[PDB]
Design a protein around this ligand. Sequence first.
Ligand SMILES: [Ca+2]
Ligand SMILES: [Ca+2]
Lengths: 77, 24
Amino acid sequence: ADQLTEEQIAEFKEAFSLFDKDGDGTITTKELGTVMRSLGQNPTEAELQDMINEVDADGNGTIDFPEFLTMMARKMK
Amino acid sequence: GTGAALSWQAAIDAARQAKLMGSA
Ligand SMILES: [Ca+2]
Ligand SMILES: [Ca+2]
């Protein structure tokens, strides 16, 4: 996954679209938190709120398209 | 320490899992 490709970009967009529930073009703690809970996984909406508060470039408390596409390409083969 | 990346990846994996299944 280290090398970029069509799949990769499309992958980021897909994942992004899934999180942006309100569909405002950005992801929020509540938006993701809901997705994390509905899935039945760690509903620690607190952990995210804290993590987002950090990666948040504008400090708006939301994750933009680029950030997600980046923080996801950090590792994982 | 770490855990942020895992949470992000775990959510994506589960999110897609639901997408493939087509549930809800
Ligand atoms: Ca939003
Ligand atoms: Ca931001």
